[PDB]
Amino acid sequence: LAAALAQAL
Ligand SMILES: *C(=O)c1ccc(-c2ccc(C(=O)OCC)cn2)nc1
Ligand SMILES: *NNC(=O)c1ccc(-c2ccc(C(N)=O)cn2)nc1
Ligand SMILES: Cc1ccccc1C
Ligand SMILES: Cc1ccccc1C
Ligand SMILES: Cc1ccccc1C
């Protein structure tokens, strides 16, 4: 989940 967001950065 975290990674899924973090791709933004
Ligand atoms: C949510 O973004 C997210 C993405 C990916 C993962 C995740 C957890 C574990 C692995 C892995 O290779 O584990 C080896 C034991 C890969 N990806 N978690 C949460
Ligand atoms: N928000 N994330 C990024 O902008 C980002 C782009 C690319 C990478 C990355 C990581 C690792 C490799 C590699 N060949 O191991 C390439 N690009 N991380 C973050
Ligand atoms: C489990 C989950 C839920 C919502 C967004 C992304 C991810 C990986
Ligand atoms: C696991 C990780 C760590 C730092 C930035 C992005 C991601 C996907
Ligand atoms: C395949 C994938 C998707 C989103 C963030 C990181 C990675 C390794």
Both ends of the chain: CA-CA distance in Å?
14
Determine whether the shortest distance from the Cβ of 4 to ligand 1 is under 6 A.
yes
Determine whether the shortest distance from the Cβ of 4 to ligand 3 is under 6 A.
yes
- Solved with: X-ray
CA of 2 to the centre of ligand 3 (A): 8
* 2 DSSP 8-state letter: H
Half-sphere exposure of 6 (CA within 13 A, CB side): 3
| Helix-strand-coil split of the chain, %, nearest 5 | 55, 0, 45
**Any idea how long the chain is?**
9
Q: Which ligand is nearest to the CA of 9?
A: 2
Determine whether the shortest distance from the Cβ of 8 to ligand 2 is under 6 A.
yes
